[PDB]
Design a protein around this ligand. Sequence first.
Ligand SMILES: Cc1cc(-c2nc3ccccc3n2C[C@@H]2CCCN(C(=O)C3CCN(C(C)C)CC3)C2)cn(C)c1=O
Length: 125
Amino acid sequence: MNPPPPETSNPNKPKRQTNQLQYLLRVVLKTLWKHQFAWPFQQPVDAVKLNLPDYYKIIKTPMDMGTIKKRLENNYYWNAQECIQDFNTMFTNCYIYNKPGDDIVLMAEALEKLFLQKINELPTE
Ligand SMILES: Cc1cc(-c2nc3ccccc3n2C[C@@H]2CCCN(C(=O)C3CCN(C(C)C)CC3)C2)cn(C)c1=O
């Protein structure tokens, strides 16, 4: 079976808008979301549909851009570094689970290069 997806809203976790979090939604997520190579990252890994019974045996902190998009839109975060952490967890999980030579690793590497370019211009608080 699949685990429940990561939460994108929590009534007990303080949240706010920062111009940095607005930049992460309007520029960073926006740019990555409709990249040609975005689609494997737009939702949680469905280990049932893909027949990957070991995925959630290996990956215990799953993350995906669908979850991050909802967290940004739902105002889940307190600061930009929490969101940048989620992006990096998504990339790290991909590189840990998958093998060099896998199409998904090339796809992640293209998205990560673009991610790092956009994060490099995170605005002043
Ligand atoms: C393992 C995995 C799968 C997916 C995924 N989300 C999908 C949504 C819709 C339809 C298909 C989807 N897939 C399948 C991948 C899509 C890109 C290309 N893929 C590969 O390169 C294989 C190569 C072989 N490897 C090995 C480790 C079994 C597994 C990956 C196959 C996403 N993420 C983040 C993953 O880490």
